Design a protein around this ligand. Structure first.
Ligand SMILES: CC1=C(CCOP(=O)(O)OP(=O)(O)O)S/C(=C(/O)CO)N1Cc1cnc(C)nc1N
Ligand SMILES: CC1=C(CCOP(=O)(O)OP(=O)(O)O)S/C(=C(/O)CO)N1Cc1cnc(C)nc1N
Ligand SMILES: O=C[C@H](O)[C@H](O)COP(=O)(O)O
Ligand SMILES: O=C[C@H](O)[C@H](O)COP(=O)(O)O
Ligand SMILES: [Ca+2]
Ligand SMILES: [Ca+2]
Lengths: 675, 675
């Protein structure tokens, strides 16, 4: 049949791509080609408009199987061709060894790190439910799309997927349909060696619906029927168990050796002949397969054309909501939204930056509907919920509604991070955030790094940033955390010192379109600074206190800026004149012009950094670094600062020693380099 | 009864400790005091010998509830007193806000970061099973101890606990008995808001046994009976559901407000009167409670005394095993074990450091029985299994035995990291390791940081360290990872360049008693270096190529040392003389004497670092840094190195620019500082 020919075409494209690279993973593509064929024939999508907001989404969580995804995208006429398949895994190609949303048309998210994609699919589905609840009206199903996810045994072993699956079942996300490649093989061999749990019973315990397809190597009728059944279960995400043979058709089918290495040339020949293909030919695409797939594309394009007319009618019937939706689909924030950001003066009271953050959210959430967010069981500590909003929950629970804006993630940092990436991936200008303590953002490092690589504008509201949290002690007090994320490409790590800087940090986080943000916020109160403003803090680094005859400049962030200002006064009594630089975001600063940066960190003056965490990275901006390179302590926060000499006198002492160390030396800016 | 009085004493000690600190968590201590009383009365332990190797272990995974643990330790006469309880959460005290194994007698592990302790308990139980299988003989139950873990809803939501619970059920760890504080309250309120899964059905799906105690606020008879039942189920770990009221007895019992803040003074008064205590008194310890607890200690001490005689008899009956066991309990490695480490010369072939690691393990595993380890589903890629060893599996599976030495962790990096901490915590000189790709050690950051804070000598075998892995691409290629762990206090991050350095790295990792190690190892082959040795590499940094008239020194690690040596030859043709420093472990280097370090990085010469990852940290050792501060690429590894100019000519060009940049300048060692 043409369906059988399509499945064979998919299998052979994937195997030929691996063969040409002499690298990659043929096994799961061979096992999942029937399911991929069946799912894509049920999906609504436009290869010529990858951003249609009512498309069904597909996520390949077992990202190593990407030769399968690339074959589907090629066959359906996305902006990816057989010539790109021939360049699988080659430097600069559109077919990298794991799918990247920035590089691959039709890749919704970046996968490859196991467990992430299923959680991203939970986030795409969460966003779709929230979006539909916000916009749909009687006779106007603006959003009614599904989220289809393929995943394997590896994803099911990673804890992040358990977190997201428990939450998805709690949230009754009936438009999520996941498919487990139940092939009983991972890299270390049989799953009997390490993965003997009853997966199906576990997913029932989360409140998922189950469909089992016992012969997923051939039974596309049953795979299609499983999708139909899943769509009838509107209050549970569904897991479809696809019992497959890894490497189906290979001489080496059913073995770990087919997971991750190219097939032998003679194996490829026998695959082709058994399926009616020419064993002398590679990258064959039968015209009948193209015709069948083109039929489905043309049908989907007529569906999108009708949706465009529905959207035009919606804008007539619901003028305000229609304009809001149009603005969001254009990627634009509300005009002058930032006038809602709070502004402070030095006469205002001291406030913790966690509380300043709460106040910002309280002002901007009502003004910017595409902001949604939550906390990982730390809502009253991170201060992430605006009073008066409703939680995102299924209405059946009585605890919220899908039109809600606040997500109770539970104690699930890693899944929260990957769900945020899925919410961003949904599109529609979502600007979403997640709260936890800064030290526990580290639990989610797998997802955070993917936010950076995927260029998603997600925001971590990361409170309790330092030893300033006090009594909870060294298990809770960050030391390495800012260095880790600052050393990751494309992460904006804001550590605002006061109210104006906190507003600048949120202006950056909400305006972002390609850079994730971590806002490192305090438990303890900080004074409003003389010289701060949203304008200057928006530069990432700025001169807070200018001193034309400076003997030293102190550069600091967050809670240590006020400390630097107090140290300036101690130094004045020692006959030393200091300037102060505030550096709320190193990434934003680094992106300013060279002349702007040199105006902040000039030649001819020693520069001392002060930040109560690791000194790593700080030599980019300073000659000497005062930091904390040991674990913290359990005690009242002011006593910890005193113990580690983060006091005005301790900073002044190190500043005076820095001035003395450079006497008789020529000093150039830390910004200078040899190359 | 005296039991009722003991429970009240525990509850009131914990509440009074929180009250004195005006900080901490009274709710779970109040709810779990009956269970704590019942479990400690079943446990065998010696407060005067916290290291008795056949003790039962207790782990408080819900570490915020530590006022409960500290109260039990005080009541049983550990080296912790009521005066220490009065200093709960105060700077420098023995009663920090979360338990720390380095500081608290009777704290087996450091908890506080949720999910960790239950996984540590899995590791303690895994080690006990392996230890018992290694040493027990007929009539000689050298090891027969249990592992008891308390955990709450937060731990059950963290994915790391799902990973370890799935693995523990697969491993049939019948001496693990966990207790879930089923109180339906977390920080964000009712568990109905985010945690509605059927926990019991999930744990059945992992192959755990279940006992439910419906009235754990009072029914110590049923808690004791649940322990007895769990001990009869020798092939499954058991979860005991303790249905409790958080803050039991408080006016605010059953609310989130009692989770995490001190009780009101009038609430404490009514608690005391309802339980027969004087509301005017704090930190009361009734003598009858002390007497009852002392009885149990005296019984346990007689059990340990009999075990000591059993051990003496074992040494007579099994002379070789007895001496091995004695050596391990003394904390000593076999005499001259390190003579088994492979040594290489520059005439030997190029080898990837992952393969060199395999070879080391193959030589040292047969010589050092306390080495055990595994991989997170990457055994044939990390090369972590010595040929001929047997896997650690229950014999009932046919796939291994508990006397085995190789652990199939599955795709569970975070749980592997926390399980390794539990294996180390068991004691008996275990030197245990876990393999994954370096980029995915980041999945386990929560546990890795705890290895450092807890001072456990665990080892990550972290292969595929850089863009040198090639085609898998930027989702797999570390950039930030070494900076992150180097910036964490107390982590030895070895990045060996060749065979001799790899042996030095393992000598350090296996000799360690207080510092975790990460070995960053290559996929790709590297040459044996002229000038390397175990002796010099053991210093952490050393002069590989000495040049008395150096115009520049190049400092490098790992794969970039050979690159630096090749660049030296290009520079010689440009009229520039270079020295080379190899820095296989920055922590080890930093611990050398100041004069040794200055002999490696002297004054008077520009120093350029070369490492194909983040430049963070490198200014400690260099004036200029050549690194990779952007994500990688999917392609053949040599082409990626060429793209980023990590070539002999690219290094030489930056070295020449560095020499020119310092012309006419006075240069002092990067090791100098102002303070
Ligand atoms: C262990 C693992 C594989 C087995 C999957 O086993 P599986 O999901 O059952 O797949 P399959 O056998 O049915 O094909 S792939 C993978 C690749 O490096 C190719 O991406 N690694 C390494 C791996 C480890 N940990 C994380 C977080 N992500 C990973 N990517
Ligand atoms: C969310 C969380 C709490 C609720 C537990 O909720 P729970 O386990 O049901 O406890 P309980 O209500 O019955 O007392 S405590 C905790 C403390 O900061 C006191 O350690 N945090 C923050 C927290 C978040 N994430 C990690 C990895 N570790 C944490 N420590
Ligand atoms: O569990 C409680 C944590 O210790 C808590 O959230 C810290 O509370 P805080 O907001 O007072 O810092
Ligand atoms: O899944 C396979 C990963 O891509 C694999 O383990 C890498 O294999 P390697 O050992 O050839 O690098
Ligand atoms: Ca599999
Ligand atoms: Ca609870």
């Amino acid at each position: 049949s043409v369906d059988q020919k399509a499945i064979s075409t998919i299998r052979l494209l994937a195997v030929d791509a691996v063969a040409a690279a002499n690298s990659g993973h043929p096994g799961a593509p061979l096992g999942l080609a029937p399911a991929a064929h069946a799912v894509f024939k049920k999906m609504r999508f436009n290869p010529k408009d990858t951003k249609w907001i009512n498309r069904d989404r597909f996520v390949l969580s077992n990202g190593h199987a990407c030769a399968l995804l690339y074959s589907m995208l090629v066959l359906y006429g996305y902006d990816l061709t057989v010539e790109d398949l021939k360049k699988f895994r080659q430097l600069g190609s559109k077919t990298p060894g794991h799918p990247e949303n920035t590089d691959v048309p039709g890749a919704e998210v970046t996968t490859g790190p196991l467990g992430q994609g299923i959680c991203n699919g939970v986030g795409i589905a969460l966003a779709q439910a929230q979006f539909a609840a916000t916009y749909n009206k009687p006779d106007f199903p603006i959003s009614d799309s599904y989220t289809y996810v393929f995943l394997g045994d590896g994803c099911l072993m990673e804890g992040v997927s358990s977190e997201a699956s428990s939450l998805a079942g709690h949230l009754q996300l009936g438009n999520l349909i996941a498919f487990w490649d139940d092939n009983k093989i991972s890299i270390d061999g049989s799953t009997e060696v390490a993965f003997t749990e009853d997966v199906i019973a576990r997913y029932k315990s989360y409140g998922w619906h189950i469909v089992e397809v016992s012969d997923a190597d051939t039974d596309i009728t049953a795979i299609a029927a499983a999708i139909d059944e899943a769509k009838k279960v509107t209050n549970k995400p569904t897991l479809v168990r696809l019992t497959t043979t890894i490497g189906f058709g290979s001489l080496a089918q059913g073995t770990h050796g087919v997971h991750g290495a190219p097939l032998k040339a003679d194996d490829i020949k026998q695959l082709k002949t058994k399926w009616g293909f020419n064993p002398e030919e590679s990258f064959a695409v039968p015209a009948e397969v193209t015709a069948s797939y083109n039929e489905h594309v043309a049908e989907n394009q007529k569906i999108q054309q009708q949706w465009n007319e529905l959207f035009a009618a919606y804008k007539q019937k619901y003028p305000e909501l229609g304009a809001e939706l149009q603005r969001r689909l254009d990627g634009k924030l509300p005009e002058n939204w930032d006038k809602a950001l709070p502004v402070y003066t030095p006469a205002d009271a001291a406030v913790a930056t966690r509380k300043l953050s709460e106040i910002v959210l309280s002002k901007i959430i009502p003004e910017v509907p595409e902001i949604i967010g939550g906390s990982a069981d730390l809502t009253p500590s991170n201060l992430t919920k605006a009073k008066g909003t409703v939680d995102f929950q299924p209405a059946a629970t009585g605890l919220g509604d899908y039109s809600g804006r606040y997500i109770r993630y539970g104690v699930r940092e890693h899944a929260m991070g990957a769900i945020m990436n899925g919410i961003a991936a949904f599109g529609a200008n979502y600007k979403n955030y997640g709260g936890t303590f800064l030290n526990f953002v580290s639990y989610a490092a797998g997802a955070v790094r993917l936010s950076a690589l995927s260029e998603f504008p997600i925001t971590w509201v990361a409170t309790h940033d330092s030893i300033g949290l006090g009594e909870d002690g060294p298990t809770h007090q960050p030391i390495e955390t800012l260095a880790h994320f600052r050393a990751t490409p494309n992460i904006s790590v804001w550590r605002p010192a006061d109210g104006n800087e906190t507003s600048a940090a949120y202006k950056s986080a909400i305006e972002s379109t390609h850079t994730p943000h971590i806002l490192a916020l305090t438990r303890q109160n900080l004074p409003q600074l003389e010289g701060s403003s949203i304008e200057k803090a928006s530069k990432g680094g700025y001169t807070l206190v200018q001193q034309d005859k400076a003997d030293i400049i102190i550069v600091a962030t967050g809670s240590e800026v006020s400390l630097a200002v107090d140290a300036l006064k101690v130094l004045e009594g020692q006959g030393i004149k200091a300037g102060v630089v505030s550096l709320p975001d190193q990434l934003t600063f680094d992106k300013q012009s060279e002349e702007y940066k040199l105006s902040v960190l000039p030649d001819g003056v020693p520069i001392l950094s002060v930040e109560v965490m690791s000194t790593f990275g700080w030599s980019k901006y300073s000659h000497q670094q005062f930091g904390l390179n040991r674990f913290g302590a359990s005690g009242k926060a002011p006593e910890i600062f005193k113990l580690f000499e983060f006091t005005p006198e301790g900073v002044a002492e190190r500043a005076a020693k820095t001035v003395a160390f450079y006497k008789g030396k020529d000093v150039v800016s830390p910004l200078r380099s040899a190359f």
